[PDB]
């Protein structure tokens, strides 16, 4: 039973429909899986069924090569018995009334990710399953809207390159379908202030020019800041006994990823100069999402411990480590609520976000989440 048909874009219709995950006319379909890839109870029960034991054998060795997922976070494993070569496994977050947004957050995270999967190996069909809605608890309403929220924000945001054009949204019961088609329905001035009070300026800027107390530079393993454009214009700016100055600091230190060192400014208008070692994309890997997050909580939270007040951020990684900026902007907004609410801070209070004038997807990537954020 089919119940709405929508355009998104020239050539692409989303399609809210009723049936079974296990046998749709549709190239991939979407696993409500949990972090061990493991299918206990569920839909993904229906599936690992279905497909028989090779279906987990696969998740069984990618979670013995790449390790456990965490929430917010999406891998793709072989279908087995299934009327499809691929599984894409969707790890949504369990639900918490207190950490609503954050939730809100991660499970978005998932779907965004499971598109660009899909787009990965050029799939032109996708079905989605109601994430989260059933074992972990999120309720069907905002669930859904998010699902679909998710899924208009891939092709609003950049419509510049795209494979899909079928994407289903599925479940057999009639009411989550139901959801998601009123779903559907209703989904169809830079400057924020978290709960516990720090606010986040968007500030169009070279990073160069920043007027905070701190600073963070985006830099290589081997250091050099001559490589890429960001570290090039602090480079420059600042004058060479920056780089002088960040060999001697990172000296007898294994430099590695994630890995963070702090510098004095010289000519440059701030005290210190945070510089880290950004993962790169990698497809947006479990661990490159870690492990990005944390250089944010840990430059905030090094801000706090020298009783500073100002830090300034740029898109690092949207470059040379290929995140896709929307995803970033995003990533980094949670991290700087998550971060101030759980926290009670004594001296830090402004997080700027510094977007090259001539950097216009960035501009624009924050700017929408900034809107949903006063929304
Ligand atoms: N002057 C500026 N002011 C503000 N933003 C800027 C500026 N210049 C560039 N951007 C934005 O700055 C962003 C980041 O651009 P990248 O310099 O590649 O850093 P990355 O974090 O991607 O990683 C690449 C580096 O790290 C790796 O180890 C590689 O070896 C490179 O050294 C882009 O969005 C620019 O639009």
Request: charge should be neutral; aromatic fraction near 6%; proline fraction near 5%.
């Amino acid at each position: 039973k089919c119940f709405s048909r929508t355009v998104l874009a020239p050539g692409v219709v989303l399609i809210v429909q009723q049936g079974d995950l296990a046998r749709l006319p549709v190239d991939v379909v979407v696993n409500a899986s949990n972090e061990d890839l493991k299918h206990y109870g569920g839909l993904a029960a229906a599936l690992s069924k279905a497909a028989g034991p090779e279906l987990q054998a696969d998740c069984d060795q990618i979670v013995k090569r790449e390790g456990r997922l965490l929430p917010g976070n999406a891998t793709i494993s072989k279908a087995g018995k299934l009327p499809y070569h691929h599984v894409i496994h969707a790890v949504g977050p369990r639900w918490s009334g207190y950490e609503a947004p954050r939730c809100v957050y991660l499970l978005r995270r998932a779907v965004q990710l499971s598109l660009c999967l899909a787009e990965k190996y050029k799939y032109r069909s996708i079905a989605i399953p109601a994430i989260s809605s059933g074992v972990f608890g999120f309720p069907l309403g905002r669930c859904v809207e998010t699902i679909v929220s998710a899924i208009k924000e891939n092709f609003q945001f950049k419509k510049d390159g795209h494979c899909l054009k079928e994407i289903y949204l599925v479940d057999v019961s009639e009411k989550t379908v139901e959801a998601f088609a009123e779903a559907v329905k209703t989904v169809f001035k830079g400057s924020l202030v978290s709960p516990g009070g720090l606010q986040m300026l968007l500030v169009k800027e070279g990073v160069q020019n920043a007027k905070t107390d701190v600073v963070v530079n985006s830099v290589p393993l081997d250091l050099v800041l001559s490589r890429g454009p960001l570290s090039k214009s602090l480079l420059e700016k600042a004058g060479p006994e920056l780089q002088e100055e960040l060999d001697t600091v990172g000296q007898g230190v294994a430099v590695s990823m994630g890995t963070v060192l702090k510098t004095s400014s010289w000519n440059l208008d701030c005290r210190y100069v945070l510089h880290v070692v950004a993962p790169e994309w990698r497809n947006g890997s479990t661990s490159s999402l870690k492990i990005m997050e944390d250089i944010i909580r840990e430059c905030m939270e090094i801000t706090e411990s020298l009783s500073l007040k100002s830090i300034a951020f740029p898109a690092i990684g949207t470059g040379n480590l290929g995140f896709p900026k929307n995803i970033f902007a995003e990533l980094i907004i949670s991290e700087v609520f998550k971060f101030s609410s759980k926290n009670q801070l004594k001296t830090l209070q402004e997080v700027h976000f510094l977007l090259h004038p001539s950097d216009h997807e960035n501009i624009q990537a924050f700017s929408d989440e900034f809107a949903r954020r006063a929304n």
